Design a protein around this nucleic acid. Structure first.
Ligand SMILES: [Mg+2]
Ligand SMILES: [Mg+2]
Ligand SMILES: [Mg+2]
Ligand SMILES: [Mg+2]
Ligand SMILES: [Mg+2]
Ligand SMILES: [Mg+2]
Ligand SMILES: [Mg+2]
Ligand SMILES: [Mg+2]
Ligand SMILES: [Mg+2]
Ligand SMILES: [Mg+2]
Ligand SMILES: [Mg+2]
Ligand SMILES: [Mg+2]
Ligand SMILES: [Mg+2]
Ligand SMILES: [Mg+2]
Ligand SMILES: [Mg+2]
Ligand SMILES: [Mg+2]
Ligand SMILES: [Mg+2]
Ligand SMILES: [Mg+2]
Ligand SMILES: [Mg+2]
Ligand SMILES: [Mg+2]
Ligand SMILES: [Mg+2]
Ligand SMILES: [Mg+2]
Ligand SMILES: [Mg+2]
Ligand SMILES: [Mg+2]
Lengths: 166, 84, 97, 122, 201, 246
RNA sequence: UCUCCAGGCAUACGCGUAUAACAACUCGGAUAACCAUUGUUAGUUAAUCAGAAUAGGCAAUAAUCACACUAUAAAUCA
RNA sequence: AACUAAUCCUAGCCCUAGCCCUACACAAAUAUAAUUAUACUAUUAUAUAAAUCAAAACAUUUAUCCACUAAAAGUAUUGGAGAAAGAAAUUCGUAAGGAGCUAUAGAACUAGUACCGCAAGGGAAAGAUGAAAGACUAAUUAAAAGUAAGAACAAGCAAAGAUUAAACCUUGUACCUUUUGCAUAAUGAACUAACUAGAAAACUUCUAACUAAAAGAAUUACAGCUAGAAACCCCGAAACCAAACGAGCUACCUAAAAACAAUUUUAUGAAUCAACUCGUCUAUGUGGCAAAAUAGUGAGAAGAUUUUUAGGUAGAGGUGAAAAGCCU
């Protein structure tokens, strides 16, 4: 057990100078001991990464997976504790900066078998962490153009040196 | 307050016999009330009363047994009431 | 492996306590005292190994000799088995013959 | 697979197995499987008349309790029998044979309430 | 039980059941054993704080947990906490006293405000009394309300309560007759049958 | 083949009251409240025994109130006498300066968030209000020159607790910041004139008691305070499919 | 309400609260709803159902619808 | 920028020394199917310890197992005179601590409890805030394997020499044990943490004390004698003997009982065929519903029949319509 994602929500930064850029807000929320697999939960967490909170609260609602409702709840708690206790002006000015699922404490039980034999069953739990950062979703990755691809090849050749000699 | 052992000694056997039944009816009522509290899942009013009554009844038992025990020693001298 | 995350408490030894200060006194009681008492007589320990040393098999047999008749049944049984194990080891095993 | 740790009671076992829960017997089983209750074996509660009783379950706090002195055989003897013997000794009308005059009981046999062995319950 | 820690809450309260569950195995507290005669601190005695946050401030003992060698003084060594906290409301901030060990406080001379050490000694009547080591003087036991909270003098007789005079009344007559034999004579029961011989063994 | 197994131990993990509270609500329990063996200690009482209704036009008086206080002193004369009996040093004329010291000193602690200093300066009733809403928040506060001298408005003693009300019109500068240092409320540095009534009370019975800041009376004619910088949405009713808006 | 399946109610031996309602939603049911799970409170009422005095004397003749009918393996306290 | 986790100190324990004991627990109940208030039928240890093991087998035999220290002395004696065993006479003596353990350690122990076996019996695991919780239970840590943060990009025991460059280019037949001193063999290892195997002083060497003498009584000596230091592991059978515990499974028997419709023969270890008993064949299953079942198909079904309840026979034995079959 180690609950550090809970403490990070309490960090206090020093006041800014009159012309410093306005620091974007960060929120740290999670839920523990969820009756779900961490491997199954990752697909839901991976999906929402890099999206807004009104664009991640829509994709989740129409997913059949059980975890979709669980994540949606902690994406609404995060969306409320940001506006009330972290000074976020607009509900629609957030985006999921990070989101991942972690292993929890499990329980060991006996799964019976057919010849007086058995195997060890584990009832699986997990945790799920999310960070929300105030600001529109960073623009997506732009694929390298053909010109950019060609430039790297030339740059690679330009770096060539005469090896193993003065 | 509950009856102390010394005070009961001053009373005669007649009062001890009468007092026991007075306490007995009190104990039944508190046992009746305490049990009813469990059914209603509500705290019993003044739960301390039962302890006082029970302690009083024990004191009456102590006094009567002591009086009888002394008489046996004088007449017979046997330490215990039952053969063994 | 894992190691302590904090320093253990400091251990302080008083080297001038009565037991340490007077340690060794009367070790020459015999030669300086007209040999009235042998220094071995000053040892505090089990009755069967005051002023005596031997290997475990000898130690086992010596414990039996002094207090064999005052020992508990289970302790005596274990001692007897301990002797028989040592006997077969020291008298029938080992690299050298 | 039998539970060894639970108490052996009459609810368990076959129909034939039976035992009491501690209730005192009050009758006799005669021949032909007929029960015959005995009135004397049935306890009778001697209940006093509580009219005019000045004692209640609880006592006033103001009333001060006294020093506890467990009654002893010597103390009872001094209170009851010693004064009679002391006065009789001065008068000279005392003899070893007539200790019963002061209340001595040579044997408990013949007493309704035998001191030892006790033949009466609480 | 070997693993039972005495705290500040009175034993058997909801707090003490919560703190000490049956499976608790907390590290034992080591307490300098103090003889019943040795102990000289009693509820209501004014004492002075030798060291701590409020060192040098005199207070009144209001609780003594002898199992922990603790003495609690009113309004001193006091930290802050919230009482009556609810989901709707924060609660009321109050200042809560903390326990002090005996060696951190001293008793006070009755006449003069000073931390005078005392010794136990008998009197002419024989009653044990505390006497100051210096400026030998009798410090009386401080009268304090009882824990149950019942006040004797103001207590008013009510139904189910015997009068003081009635309790004091004595009617026991020393006689060599059992209760089983006095009741029958008083109640007029007559029985002429006698139990048959019984073979005890 | 062989066979051996282990038990699923019940493992109750509730070692704390927060864990126990969940346990007793799920498990169910009769938790009878108890009469505290030792009564709790109160160094202050929430509220004012007699609140002095502020007089309309008190700002227009730009002596003056002090004369009015003299007429109102007769109402508070009984309270003043009680202070003399237990203190004998309290002075109505000199209290403003002392009270002024407490007010300025207390608000300064906020700058450094010195909880220990505040507890001495303010009462147990005052402390939770000032500090509770300023957790994880930096507050910059200074004292600009006072516009007018302070006077003692009213004093009341009930029990035994004595409460003193002081009129304070002083210019101040306050700027609150978020955790991230962004600015909410107030202004970086601009003098603002503030008129308020502050209640100072002391425990007459306790030997170690002292005058502290308990509460501030707010008048109805007070002008609205500075509005917060950020815009806020007052949400609308949340309606189930059954319900309909009106 | 509809569709379809076809060992069911008691007794004994056994088991020992798994019974019933309420409340919870950690654990158990191999998933859910719901509880068989957790906690609290209750429960199964009998003269008929069921279970738990002495000393002598003396018995040739089955059962099977017991009549017919035969047989052989020769067959229940009063 | 963290999940899983890790850190921790006292609970008790170990070996000695001293010391015989006089801790035999209200009231009630228990030898009846223990813990059921009263009569029935009454109540009582054991003939010599064996074997393993050693004698490189085994058959006589085999220290301890099975009467004060040191010396005489490993001497006299005994012994398939082998392994081995081993005296006495006679001398001598007044006798509370820890270079121990600290939660996989120390006792099995938080407990002879849970759990397992019909029974005898076998037998665990774990805990961790602070002065105060009548201060919203602390802390502390890039720290194990495992994951996440952050899937991958021709080519190869995964590396090394390198290089401007992570990969391309060059060089290179996993480890241990084991076989011959060879493996592309053959054994053993998914990984992490903790635990887990060389021990004795006759002879020798080295170092000192005194020295025809050495040794704090008995010993050795034609330079010796005394003291010191210096040495020889771990895990694993099939078995053998003693004494308890088992016939609620199963073989057999005693006693008290129960079930058998319809049809045809007749008057029955006869016939057709259910209930019921059994288990010829095929198929599926194969960690299975099942540590022997399921679906079909088959055999008997008034008898040497099946079933129920209680009791008896116990391992050098019991039982056996003999399969060396059964006896949880
Ligand atoms: Mg099975
Ligand atoms: Mg697995
Ligand atoms: Mg139910
Ligand atoms: Mg329900
Ligand atoms: Mg299943
Ligand atoms: Mg239930
Ligand atoms: Mg009947
Ligand atoms: Mg051999
Ligand atoms: Mg052989
Ligand atoms: Mg252990
Ligand atoms: Mg263990
Ligand atoms: Mg790691
Ligand atoms: Mg390569
Ligand atoms: Mg392998
Ligand atoms: Mg071996
Ligand atoms: Mg049988
Ligand atoms: Mg057979
Ligand atoms: Mg038929
Ligand atoms: Mg068969
Ligand atoms: Mg056929
Ligand atoms: Mg046929
Ligand atoms: Mg037939
Ligand atoms: Mg054959
Ligand atoms: Mg078997």
């Amino acid at each position: 057990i180690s609950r550090k994602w809970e403490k990070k929500n309490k960090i206090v930064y020093p006041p800014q100078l009159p012309g410093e850029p306005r620091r974007p807000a960060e929120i740290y929320h999670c839920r523990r001991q969820i009756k779900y697999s961490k491997d199954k939960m990752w697909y839901l967490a991976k999906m929402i990464r890099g999206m807004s909170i009104d664009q991640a609260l829509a994709q989740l609602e129409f997913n059949d997976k059980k975890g979709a409702q669980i994540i949606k709840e902690v994406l609404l708690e995060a969306q409320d504790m940001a506006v009330r206790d972290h000074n976020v002006e607009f509900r629609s000015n957030l985006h999921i900066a990070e989101s991942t699922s972690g292993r929890g404490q499990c329980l060991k039980r006996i799964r019976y078998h057919g010849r007086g034999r058995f195997g060890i069953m584990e009832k699986v739990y997990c945790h799920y962490f999310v960070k929300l950062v105030e600001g529109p979703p960073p623009p997506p990755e732009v694929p390298k153009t053909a010109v950019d691809h060609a430039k790297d090849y030339i740059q690679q050749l330009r770096s060539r040196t005469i090896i193993h000699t003065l | 307050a509950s009856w102390t052992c010394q005070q009961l000694r001053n009373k005669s056997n007649e009062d001890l016999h009468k007092l026991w039944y007075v306490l007995l009816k009190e104990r039944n009522m508190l046992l009746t009330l305490e049990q009813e509290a469990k059914r209603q899942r509500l705290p019993m009013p003044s739960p301390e009363r039962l302890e006082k009554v029970v302690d009083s009844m024990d004191n009456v038992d102590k006094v009567v047994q002591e009086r009888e025990d002394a008489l046996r020693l004088l007449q017979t001298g046997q330490e215990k009431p039952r053969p063994g | 492996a894992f190691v302590r995350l904090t320093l253990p408490p400091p251990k302080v030894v008083d080297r001038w306590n009565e037991k340490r200060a007077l340690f060794g006194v009367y070790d020459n009681i015999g030669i300086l005292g007209n040999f009235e008492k042998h220094p071995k007589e000053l040892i505090k320990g089990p009755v069967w190994l005051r002023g005596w040393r031997g290997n475990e098999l000898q130690r086992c047999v010596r414990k039996k000799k002094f207090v064999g008749n005052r020992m508990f049944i289970e302790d005596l049984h274990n001692l007897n088995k301990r002797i028989s194990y040592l006997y077969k080891h020291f008298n029938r095993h080992g690299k050298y013959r | 697979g039998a539970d060894r740790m639970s108490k052996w009671t009459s609810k368990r076992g076959p129909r034939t197995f039976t035992k009491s829960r501690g209730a005192k017997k009050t009758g006799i089983y005669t021949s032909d499987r007929k029960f015959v209750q005995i009135k004397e074996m049935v306890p009778e509660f001697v209940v006093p008349d509580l009219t005019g009783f000045k004692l209640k379950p609880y006592v006033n706090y103001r009333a001060p309790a006294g020093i506890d002195t467990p009654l002893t055989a010597k103390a009872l003897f001094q209170e009851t029998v010693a004064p009679a013997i002391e006065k009789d000794f001065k008068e000279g009308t005392f003899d070893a044979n007539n200790l019963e005059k002061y209340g001595f009981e040579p044997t408990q046999e013949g007493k309704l309430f035998q001191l030892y062995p006790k033949n009466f319950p609480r | 039980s070997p693993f039972y820690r005495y705290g500040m809450s009175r034993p058997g309260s909801i707090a003490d059941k919560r703190k000490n569950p049956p499976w608790s195995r907390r590290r034992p507290v080591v307490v300098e054993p103090i003889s019943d005669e040795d102990w000289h601190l009693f509820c209501g005695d004014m004492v002075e704080i030798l060291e701590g946050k409020d060192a040098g401030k005199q207070g009144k003992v209001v609780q003594v947990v002898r199992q922990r060698n603790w003495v609690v003084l009113e309004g001193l060594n006091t930290h802050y906490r919230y009482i009556g906290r609810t989901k709707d409301h924060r609660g009321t901030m109050i200042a809560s006293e903390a326990p002090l060990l005996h060696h951190q406080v001293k008793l006070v001379d009755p006449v003069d405000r000073k931390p005078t050490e005392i010794q136990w000694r008998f009197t002419e009547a024989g009653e044990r009394v505390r006497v100051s080591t210096r400026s030998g003087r009798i410090i009386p036991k401080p009268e304090f309300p009882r824990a149950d909270g019942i006040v004797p003098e103001t207590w008013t007789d009510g139904p189910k309560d015997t009068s003081v005079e009635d309790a004091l009344e004595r009617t026991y007559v020393p006689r060599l007759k059992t209760l089983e034999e006095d009741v029958m004579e008083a109640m007029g029961i007559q029985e002429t049958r006698r139990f048959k011989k019984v073979y005890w063994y | 083949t062989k066979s051996r197994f282990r038990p699923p131990t019940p493992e109750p993990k509730y070692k704390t009251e927060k864990e126990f509270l969940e346990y007793a609500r799920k498990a169910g329990l009769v938790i009878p409240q108890e009469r505290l063996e030792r009564p709790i200690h109160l160094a202050c009482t929430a509220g004012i025994f007699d609140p002095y209704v502020p007089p309309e036009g008190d700002a227009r008086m730009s002596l003056t109130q002090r004369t009015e206080r003299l007429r109102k002193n007769a109402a508070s004369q009984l309270a003043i006498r009680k202070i003399r009996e237990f203190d004998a040093n309290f002075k109505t004329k000199d209290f403003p300066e002392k009270a002024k010291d407490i007010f300025i000193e207390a608000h300064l602690c906020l700058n450094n968030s010195d909880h220990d200093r505040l507890h001495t300066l303010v009462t147990e009733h005052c402390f939770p209000d000032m500090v509770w809403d300023l957790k994880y928040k930096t507050v910059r506060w200074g004292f600009v020159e006072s516009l007018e001298p302070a006077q003692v408005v009213h004093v009341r003693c009930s029990g035994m607790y004595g409460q003193v009300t002081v009129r304070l019109h002083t210019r101040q500068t306050l700027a609150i910041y978020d955790r991230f240092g962004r600015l909410m409320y107030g202004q970086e540095d601009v003098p603002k004139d503030v008129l308020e009534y502050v209640v100072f009370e002391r425990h007459l019975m306790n030997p170690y008691g002292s005058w502290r800041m308990h509460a501030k009376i707010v008048p109805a004619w007070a002008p609205p305070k500075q509005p917060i910088l950020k815009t806020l949405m007052i949400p609308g009713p949340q309606l189930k499919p059954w319900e309909e808006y009106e």
